[PDB]
């Protein structure tokens, strides 16, 4: 077909079968692709109440119709499965090259079922698929796993894999691809580990079918020109990476410090993208077909070269732990990529532990055997905790599954900066009202990128809003939630929003898939359908709307100092308005009229 390949790879690890199925084009179009196609597939094939580490969970790797097409940022794909860290839907995105090889191999999506009786890996070369013994790879870090597979797979194969953390079912385990790219949050890597799946190698020799090659080329050249002319997409991101945000968020007084105890630090420029570019940066590391190139390639203190850190990583191993050692952040990022864990949950769990120590919940005797401290700014101890958390060594075992469970153990849940048990990232919502809505209602838990209200409230895209204001924020958050669901579903990068809007996405989709398949209104409505489908999945999984909240600190403790001094998030007023503008009930339940309007009639009367 055009855009979509038309084929799905179903792999049952108990029966050790690899079978081809025809893609349901109607469903793939109705849910756009990638995210939406994966969630609908999972919802249709599992009971959401199941334990996410049970063999009955499904591990889905899905691409979008634009994944692999000659358009800007077409290297994106997603992992969809029940998320074991949160109990919610798991929707984790990754770039690099792996997903493009899968699409060039003729597959739009892989559904992995059940569990292998021993560690295995999947080897794909176009339509050739084999399950093989992975006993000699089990236990190896991402880089070594990749090098070992390169010795026994076809040249040019890309590697997707879990590290030791995923093998041990850590709830902060990530899915790694291309050595340093990752579908990281939700503990999705532990689902792969629960299936005894160590890796999937993929080589694709095909091309993505285009309905109109020359039109696609004309549309692509136009969008790239806009991105290259945009100050952020054309200059800031390529030069400083996402790390460009350090000084921006800090100057607005919404950069979390010491586990959100503060919101501003006069040391932030030591870990800025400007400092990184002037020192350890070797070069950009752009994903497939990407003119932005925000990817970082850096030099570790020992001279080793490797993928560099993103903004959220610079924050969680820097300001959040009271550390301002940039070399150390580069090392921590490498260690998280090698062990296969989400940087954000890792650093913010260490930050929660440092606060529990600050407040006397953790005693010196409990960590003496580890020979590490939990003192703010102790960079060496912070780095040392990573390995101990991954392998459950000494006190590290209490941090292996995240801050929410760690703080519950000490009877101090108030020190876990999480929503649905997932750690909130590097933006203090007390000074960003619309963005705080995203954190509270995000279907995948505490997360900023499924609703980056940072764009309009701080960066001025597509317009500048007053971040302290309340009027209009609920509706704006809904729009960003639905637009992000479209971009995730297409197989493109969210950073295209630095220059592009809905019509640009319609232009690229129609040029690739077929003239007039979607219009700006129908496509955004599809994003609303996808977000609402995720909500129904969470309701079926037992995730009540009462889990739409923020830590008490962010609702009651005014920011103590800085440009946002005095502010708290006003969720009490914004959440009901968010449900209302979504067409949901006061208990956050999609109404019968809303389900009919979104084409979700099969779910009427069930919630
Ligand atoms: S903007 Fe960055 S994350 Fe997005 S596709 Fe390009 S290099 Fe990758
Ligand atoms: Cl679960």
From TrEMBL:
Write down the SMART domains for this protein, in alphabetical order.
AFOR_N
Keyword tags: 4Fe-4S, Iron, Iron-sulfur, Metal-binding, Oxidoreductase
Q: Which GO terms describe its molecular function?
A: 4 iron, 4 sulfur cluster binding; electron transfer activity; metal ion binding; oxidoreductase activity, acting on the aldehyde or oxo group of donors, iron-sulfur protein as acceptor
Question: Where in the numbering of this chain does the Aldehyde ferredoxin oxidoreductase N-terminal domain appear?
Answer: 4-206
State the superkingdom.
Bacteria
Instruction: Return the protein name.
Output: Aldehyde ferredoxin oxidoreductase
Named cofactor requirement(s): tungstopterin; [4Fe-4S] cluster
Family matches, as InterPro entries: Ald_Fedxn_OxRdtase_dom2, Ald_Fedxn_OxRdtase_dom3, Ald_Fedxn_OxRdtase_N, Ald_Fedxn_OxRdtase_N_sf, OxRdtase_Ald_Fedxn_C, Tungsten_al_ferr_oxy-like_C, W-dependent_AOR
Q: Which residues bind [4Fe-4S] cluster?
A: 287, 290, 294, 493
Write down the species. Answer: Clostridium autoethanogenum
Residues annotated as coiled-coil are none
Stated family: Belongs to the AOR/FOR family.
């Amino acid at each position: 077909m055009y855009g979509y390949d038309g084929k799905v790879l179903r792999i049952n690890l108990k029966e050790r079968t690899c079978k081809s199925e025809n893609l349901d084009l109607d469903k793939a179009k109705k849910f756009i692709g990638c995210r939406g196609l994966g969630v609908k597939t999972l919802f249709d094939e599992i009971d959401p109440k199941i334990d996410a580490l049970s063999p009955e969970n499904k591990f889905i790797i899905v691409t979008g119709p634009l994944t692999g097409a000659p358009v800007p940022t077409s290297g994106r794909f997603m992992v969809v499965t029940k998320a074991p860290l949160t109990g919610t839907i798991g929707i984790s995105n990754s770039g690099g090259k792996w997903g493009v090889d899968l699409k060039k191999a003729g597959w739009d999506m892989i559904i992995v079922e059940d569990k292998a009786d021993s560690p295995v890996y999947i080897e794909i070369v176009d339509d050739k698929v084999e399950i093989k013994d992975a006993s000699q790879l089990w236990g190896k870090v991402t880089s070594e796993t990749t090098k070992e597979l390169e010795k026994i797979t076809e040249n040019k194969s890309k590697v997707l894999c879990i590290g030791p953390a995923g093998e041990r079912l850590s709830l902060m385990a990530a899915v790694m691809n291309d050595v340093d790219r990752t579908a990281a949050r939700g503990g999705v890597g532990a689902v792969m580990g629960s299936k005894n799946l160590k890796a999937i190698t993929v080589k694709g020799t095909g091309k993505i079918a285009l309905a109109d090659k020359e039109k696609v080329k004309k549309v692509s050249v136009e969008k790239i020109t806009t991105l290259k002319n945009d100050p952020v997409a054309g200059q800031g991101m390529p030069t400083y990476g996402t790390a460009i945000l350090v000084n921006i968020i800090n100057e607005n007084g919404v950069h979390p410090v010491k586990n959100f105890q503060e919101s501003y630090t006069n040391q932030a420029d030591k870990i800025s993208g400007e400092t990184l570019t002037a020192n350890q940066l070797v070069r950009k590391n752009p994903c497939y077909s990407c003119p932005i190139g925000c990817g970082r390639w850096v030099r570790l203190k020992d001279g080793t070269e490797c993928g560099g850190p993103e903004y959220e990583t610079l924050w969680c191993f820097g300001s959040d732990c009271g550390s301002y050692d940039l070399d150390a952040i580069n090392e921590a990022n490498m260690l998280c990529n090698e062990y296969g864990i989400d940087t954000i949950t890792c650093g913010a769990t260490i930050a929660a532990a440092m606060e529990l120590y600050q407040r006397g919940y953790i005693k010196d005797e409990e960590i003496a055997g580890d020979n590490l401290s939990l003192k703010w700014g102790d960079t060496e101890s912070m780095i040392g905790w990573i390995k101990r958390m991954v392998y459950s060594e000494g006190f590290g075992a209490k941090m292996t599954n995240g801050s929410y469970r760690l703080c519950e153990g000490y009877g101090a849940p108030e020190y876990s900066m999480t929503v649905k048990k997932q750690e909130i990232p590097a933006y203090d919502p007390r000074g960003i009202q619309g963005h705080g809505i995203t954190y509270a209602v995000n279907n995948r838990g505490g997360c900023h990128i499924k609703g980056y209200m940072i764009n309009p409230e701080i960066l001025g895209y597509p317009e500048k809003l007053d971040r302290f204001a309340l009027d209009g924020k609920a509706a704006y958050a809904k729009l960003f939630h639905d637009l992000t669901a479209v971009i995730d579903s297409l197989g493109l990068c969210i950073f295209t929003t630095f220059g592009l809007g809905i019509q640009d996405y319609v232009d690229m989709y129609n040029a690739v898939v077929g003239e007039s398949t979607y219009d700006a209104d129908s496509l955004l409505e599809a994003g609303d359908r996808i977000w609402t489908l995720e909500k129904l999945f969470n309701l079926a999984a037992g995730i009540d709307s009462s889990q739409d909240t923020l830590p008490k600190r962010l609702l009651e403790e005014p920011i103590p100092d800085g440009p946002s001094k005095g502010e708290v998030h006003r969720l009490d007023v914004l959440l009901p308005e968010y449900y209302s503008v979504r067409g949901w009930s006061k208990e956050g339940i999609p109404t019968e009229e809303t389900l009919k309007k979104l084409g979700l009639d099969e779910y009427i009367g069930k919630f």
